[PDB]
Amino acid sequence: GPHMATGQDRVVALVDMDCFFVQVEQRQNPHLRNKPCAVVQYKSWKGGGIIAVSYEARAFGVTRSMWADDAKKLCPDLLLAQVRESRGKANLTKYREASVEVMEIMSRFAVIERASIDEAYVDLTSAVQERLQKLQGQPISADLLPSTYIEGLPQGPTVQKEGMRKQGLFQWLDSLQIDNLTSPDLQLTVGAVIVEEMRAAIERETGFQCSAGISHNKVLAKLACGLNKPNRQTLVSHGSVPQLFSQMPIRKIRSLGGKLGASVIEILGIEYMGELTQFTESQLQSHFGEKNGSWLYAMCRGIEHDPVKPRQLPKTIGCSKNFPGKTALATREQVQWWLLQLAQELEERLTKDRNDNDRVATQLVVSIRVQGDKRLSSLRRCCALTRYDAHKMSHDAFTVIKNCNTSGIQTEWSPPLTMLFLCATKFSAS
DNA sequence: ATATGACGCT
DNA sequence: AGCGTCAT
Ligand SMILES: Nc1nc2c(ncn2[C@H]2C[C@H](O)[C@@H](COP(=O)(O)NP(=O)(O)OP(=O)(O)O)O2)c(=O)[nH]1
Ligand SMILES: [Mg+2]
Ligand SMILES: [Mg+2]
């Protein structure tokens, strides 16, 4: 009881842009705003692959990884914006720059960890302490939380969605202990006040809307964030966890969406995250290893200790392209030409990076995929990255993979290459 | 015929 | 180092 830690030590948020690439294209082109809209890359094969979908288009069943031609069957009036294409490949620069807009705003409030192109974790523990002293045990008004849901509420003894939201919020606020600066629920609440402010600033200054989760750790914040998308934020308290997890499929928790999660379900014969509480830590460790077992034992209780890393910038800078089916690269001159296209984009991005961020990459990782192999990568090799020069980088990349060629013929490259990937890594200050 | 980026294992 | 996992 009195010595059992409860993982209520931090206030952590996860901010995620709503249909991000779509919002970027909608800001630029007002004709797309408030429409069923999707963002696709390429266009020839079945109209392009969809990678972002507006909430209006989602209502018709349009999803990520759908071909545009297929999406149009679900949604005849679907509007499309295409990813820029440069040097014969998708060029994501517009979205990366839009991401930086958002991240720089977030960074004004607190330490952020860039988690993807459109989301960041925020460690609000300090900011919350500040704001709490700033306040004089002053009650928190529901007016400070106009887009916040409290997960699990309302409960106990309206038919509108906004109605429910306020009911739950009222119940939450009516029960808060505002004179105890160390109440975790109070700290979460103040955290949510700050995230309202953050989300307001992002929208005012960029035009982009986002959702957020506020809880005591990254996993719960990320889970919370998805509970009430779009344009809303969700507070998941420590106390909400038993009911929330009691029907929560294991695959919904970050890192359990793949094979480990499947084995948890398979080996233990369970479905829901809460069902994990019935196993001892040693049991879980026996099945899934020391780290995973410990992590699971704590997580199913709502406890997780992964820190918000102070890192706003990506650690690697890479470019890749798939060459599916018949388009697989079959000749030496083909492989070289595409390595060059990749290396030229990489040079551009690295030079920009060196100027903006005062660092230089020192290692170049070269990765390929051969026809027949259904892995992400067939093979990875590194070499020194000593100069930001596309021709040198592409020549080096070729050198470290040219032995993979099975062909005896000068011209030919067998087996044909279905993917090329160049990645700059191991940065140093500059 | 579905462009990236972080991290763990050995 | 090079491979595998998980993710957006
Ligand atoms: N090239 C490529 N881009 C992708 C992929 N997946 C996502 N992107 C891009 C496109 C996404 O816009 C962006 C953010 O990824 P999310 O946060 O998972 N989804 P979104 O923000 O669209 O909607 P919401 O969060 O409201 O559910 O990352 C992919 O598989 N490939
Ligand atoms: Mg998003
Ligand atoms: Mg995201």
Fold and architecture overview:
Strand 10 (210-215), helix 8 and strand 11 (233-235) form a beta-alpha-beta unit. Strands 7-8-1-10-11-9 form a six-stranded mixed β-sheet. Strands 12, 13, 14, 15 and 16 form a five-stranded antiparallel β-sheet that branches. By secondary structure, the chain is α+β, with helices and mostly antiparallel strands. The chain starts with 11 loop residues before the first strand and ends with a strand. The protein is built from 14 helices and 16 strands. It folds into four domains: 1-18 and 89-249, 2-Layer Sandwich (Alpha-Beta Plaits), CATH 3.30.70; 19-88, MutS, DNA mismatch repair protein, domain I (3-Layer(aba) Sandwich), CATH 3.40.1170.60; 250-307, DNA polymerase, domain 1, CATH 1.10.150; 308-430, Dna Ligase, domain 1 (2-Layer Sandwich). It has helices at 20-28, 55-58, 68-74, 93-107, 125-133, 161-174, 184-206, 218-225, 241-246, 259-268, 281-288, 290-299, 332-357, 390-401; strands at residues 12-17, 37-41, 49-53, 79-82, 85-86, 89-90, 112-116, 119-123, 148-150, 210-215, 233-235, 317-322, 329-331, 359-370, 379-384, 412-429. The structure holds the ligand Nc1nc2c(ncn2[C@H]2C[C@H](O)[C@@H](COP(=O)(O)NP(=O)(O)OP(=O)(O)O)O2)c(=O)[nH]1 and magnesium ion (2 copies). The protein binds a DNA duplex (10 and 8 nucleotides) through residues 16, 20, 41, 45-46, 49, 51, 64-65, 67, 83, 89-90, 92, 115-119, 254-260, 291, 314-316, 318-322, 324-327, 375-377, 379-382, 421, 423. The PDB classes it as transferase/dna. The entry lists the keywords Catalytic Domain, DNA-Directed DNA Polymerase, Y-family polymerase, DNA Binding. The assembly is trimeric.
